[PDB]
UniProtKB/Swiss-Prot annotation, chain A:
The keyword Cell membrane applies. Residues 518-657 form the STAS domain. The gene is Slc26a4. Residues 92, 140-174, 223-246, 300-327, 389-404, 453-469 are extracellular. The keyword Cell membrane applies. This is Pendrin. Keywords: Cell membrane, Chloride, Membrane, Transmembrane, Transmembrane helix, Transport. Belongs to the SLC26A/SulP transporter (TC 2.A.53) family. GO terms for biological process: animal organ morphogenesis; regulation of pH; regulation of protein localization. Highly expressed in the kidney (at protein level). Throughout the endolymphatic duct and sac, in distinct areas of the utricle and saccule, and in the external sulcus region within the cochlea. Expressed in the parotid gland. It comes from the Eukaryota. InterPro entries: S04_transporter_CS, SLC26A/SulP_dom, SLC26A/SulP_fam, STAS_dom, STAS_dom_sf. Its main location: membrane. It is a multi-pass membrane protein.
From Swiss-Prot, chain B:
PANTHER family: SULFATE TRANSPORTER. Keywords: Cell membrane, Chloride, Membrane, Transmembrane, Transmembrane helix, Transport. The gene is Slc26a4. This is Pendrin. It comes from Mus musculus (Mouse). Pfam families: STAS, Sulfate_transp.
Amino acid sequence: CSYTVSRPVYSELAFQQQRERRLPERRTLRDSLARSCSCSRKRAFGVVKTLLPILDWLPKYRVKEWLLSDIISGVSTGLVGTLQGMAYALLAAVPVQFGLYSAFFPILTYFVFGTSRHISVGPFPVVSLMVGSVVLSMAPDDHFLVPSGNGSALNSTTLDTGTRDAARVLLASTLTLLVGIIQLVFGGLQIGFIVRYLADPLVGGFTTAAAFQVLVSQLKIVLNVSTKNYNGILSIIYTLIEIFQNIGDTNIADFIAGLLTIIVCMAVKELNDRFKHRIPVPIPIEVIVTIIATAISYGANLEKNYNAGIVKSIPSGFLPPVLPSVGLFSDMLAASFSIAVVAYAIAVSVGKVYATKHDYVIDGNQEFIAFGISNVFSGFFSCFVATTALSRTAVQESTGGKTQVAGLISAVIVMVAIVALGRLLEPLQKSVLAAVVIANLKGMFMQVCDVPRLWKQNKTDAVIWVFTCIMSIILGLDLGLLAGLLFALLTVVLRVQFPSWNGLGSVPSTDIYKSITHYKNLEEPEGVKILRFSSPIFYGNVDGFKKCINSTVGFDAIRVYNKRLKALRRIQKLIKKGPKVPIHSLVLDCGAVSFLDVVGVRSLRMIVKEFQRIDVNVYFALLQDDVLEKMEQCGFFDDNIRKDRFFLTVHDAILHLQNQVKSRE
Amino acid sequence: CSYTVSRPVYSELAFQQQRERRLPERRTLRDSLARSCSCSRKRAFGVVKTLLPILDWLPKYRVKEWLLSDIISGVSTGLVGTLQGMAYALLAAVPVQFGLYSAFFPILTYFVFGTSRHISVGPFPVVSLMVGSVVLSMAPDDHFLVPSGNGSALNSTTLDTGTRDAARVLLASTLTLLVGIIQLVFGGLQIGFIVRYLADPLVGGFTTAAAFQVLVSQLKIVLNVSTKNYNGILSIIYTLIEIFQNIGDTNIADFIAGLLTIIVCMAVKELNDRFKHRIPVPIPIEVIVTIIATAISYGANLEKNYNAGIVKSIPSGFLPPVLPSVGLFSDMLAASFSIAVVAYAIAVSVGKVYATKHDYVIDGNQEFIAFGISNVFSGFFSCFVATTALSRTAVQESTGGKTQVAGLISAVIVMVAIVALGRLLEPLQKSVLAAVVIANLKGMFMQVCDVPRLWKQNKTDAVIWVFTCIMSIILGLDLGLLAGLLFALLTVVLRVQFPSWNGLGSVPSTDIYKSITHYKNLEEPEGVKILRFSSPIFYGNVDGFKKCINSTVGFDAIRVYNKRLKALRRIQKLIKKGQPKVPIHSLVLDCGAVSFLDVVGVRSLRMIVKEFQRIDVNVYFALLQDDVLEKMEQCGFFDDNIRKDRFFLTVHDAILHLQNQV
Ligand SMILES: [Cl-]
């Protein structure tokens, strides 16, 4: 219909006279914490059910067909997960058995404390790369070589194959324990707002750079070259230059096999993803390619006749739990925090995706606690940080998964692949394991295709993407994330420091005020100059407010008053011998302000005082109640700056000005 | 007075269909690159006037309270300038001969270039150790170490002199020139917006521990306690516990001398503040306590008969300008960059602290080139860096002082002290001049009284003030301002992430919408609620905006959807076998205080509309004035069903829309 109102001009004081405010609630800190301390059985049962979600979905099972669905999804996910674990084990500088270890125990630990249903907790390429990088930093290769072997000229300081793996495994276990402790601290203390700073473009650029580094590392492993574990600044660029310079020490057979399996896996994966309408179950190309590689590699002696690179270092058994080597937390706290936050971000992303796909809820703090307990249990059994791979989770969701029982069954596959089966994978070339990782990088590599899309969108979001992607390549990968969050916060500060001020005017015979730089036929008040200033004024943008006012009024309240004083002394000397023309008022439409930052209210009062000397009134239009309640406490309403200066709506100020001009010439 | 604003309800598409837009000017730089200053001489005269900040206040000062006020203030800050030059030179591992030059030459070039009063340019204590650190690193202590002198057993490895200090001064002179040219090149690209990030609590919380740092640094010289040099973390605490641990070897004669002078100087200072209406000109007790100290010392020989500590090393005569070594600028470039940043930080910090007591707000771009060329002019003469001490700027402002001319007359006092008045201030006990800085230090020590004042005004800046103070004590003055600057920006992003969201409600028989948590006797439309986030929806407050909705509507759109389909599948199988929703119709987000949006915000805001659409509950919007609206349609917010009709110009138009719809 229509919109018509009629009311007196309640500016600021005509509103608080006949409006009984709501008294604040009594704090009573003692009784508040006493009442907050729950003691009834209802809250106890609630927190028990929340902390241990295993007792929720288990009694209400649908065993009839869920048993078959879970067993088939479990065998499929177990095969895929043991393959991905034995592949990512190379990224953690640990033998091939510890990937299967980190694929078995975290599942058992997440089964009794997790809150998801489709998340396959296991290894991850980015997390494994970060773990390997921090292990190489804390334990380089040239720190274990033992002089033995009667060398030609000097002492035979060859490789330390053996006890080196034990030190690397102990370091990885300590890192996993520290990451679990950090995650438990973040979860229990309810400090979960720290992961909100990981924006979508930021995490996209970080995943792109991490996928590029994973590609570099896996190409190094495939070519069978020997680098010097370049870590720190420009690590990826330096190791890529070294690879390009050390091409001569390659293996033609290993390179050919790697390229062949890369092409085959990529083609089969693209065919299965595109033509899904003909094949419902995704073909496990990884499983069949690993089987055929183990078959061919055992037919001919690829180790002796072709000098290939195989694992052949499987003990095929378990080991008693070992206590973590405490003392290395101070030199790895930042790395553990980075690994924990990136793992939690990836886990929450995968969980939200596969939860909005299946329409169920996933709690954040519960996932934090579950992953913390999982990493703590993994630290006692020599495992690395566990996460949920996008490719590994997709298999369990595509084959059909309802509860975590499929994951529990997925551990049984790794179980049987640990105890007895597994030594058949002895002649498996390391190139095949190092190739499937590259084939799975297609998802994070296509993330580069969003920069042309984000650039047409809000440009500041695209700059964060490019900055995070580039900076996470120059100064390593762990320190690259810290340079991204700080840059994102600085970009947020820049958007509130440089607002979009306009010349707000009124449409003819209306009450709504729109900008003047975007419309043509708008009427402005005679003498009055309206100004709207978003991005609330704080200590960093108050000079911007001064400059904006000086630009929108045409003059400066300082220079005009100085010229008036200079002309005044000329008057008092001539009688003894014997600028601000169009501007009538200034209506500040500060309606988009949230905080006031008293450091800024000081300058606001200074502006109001300076404009009074030049006889130019400066009013306010749409200030909020919580802002006036703060300006009152900050010492702003003196005997001269009353409340009549402020207003409720933008049109009320113009109406009051017109009435004052009509009633007072 | 009522007013008739009868107007049909206008949505976004209903307001742009009859009005017209304005073609935005792209303003390409291919043809507009010569629009700043092409031929107009007015802009050329303006930049020259701002480049030379001497034709502004010098042809404008009033000699009424200028001559006698600044002269007595100049001798006060000039005396302190001599003491710091004689003290900081020894800490910089260089011979104590050029400290007076660092207080004479930089003031001359800064008197004409630079508009910042109540600042005495010269050496700074924490910046002098940084110079001595990079000098001792790139210059061995023993250059030749001549093994001659017929020692006890082996050759007497006497430390080489003459050429040693000459190389140290040469290295220090090159460092000042390198910091100067780097200070100037920063002013080239006009990066002067960094001064806007220094808030009053930031500079206030910074110049209170520095006042405590200058207190303990003058306390170790007033007690003659030989302590080691400490910098970095826990620098102030380690020096404080060292004095209390090494308090034994304290000169009793010098202790009772300084303690008697610190009392008599502050007593007459507050006496002048009480009787300021009786005596027009403030009596310069600084020059009074100085002449009486040299009188009682020269007439009693407090050094060779009492061991009180005197200067006894005042040099004489200027030195010709010496050319630096260009071949060594490359090595200093890696370390002088960090020193150059912290130098300008302290330089402007002592400028903003006095901007709160007098309306003398300064600009960063002009001060960056002012201290820049001054250190360049400090070069070629073997001077120090062009910083400004916290003790000299306190004694100048508290004891009168109107313009920067007090620094000019101060150099004249040092100019005559080096050529003709060297033997005059010889027996100075180094206590009446090292304790006078403590008297004028009350101007910054009393700045801790704003903590209960700022706490009652705004809790955020009160925490910022105390945070920078306690952090500058632990992490030193170097990393104190940097850690406080990041903490200051962190409070800005936190206050914009967690706003004061409240549900709004109209007043009876009117169209004014205010918060319902702060008022009574309000009314809410049956089935329609209002929510005002009052903050931009960026990547940080994405879930916070979601938690703002589900806590205001009572339910959660996620949990009511899965239970709805669960009951739907429950009743579906019962048909084959055989057979908590709130009445709120819609919600209008009063997101009118938003200033910017991001890709994460527009995506999450779209998911909210799609989520409530599945629950048969509509979601409407409010005033997206000019930018937040055009940014949404650019990020692909409207694809097939979501249109700009769901938006509204005013909050009451949204209420009237849902009213006549049902
Ligand atoms: Cl993956």
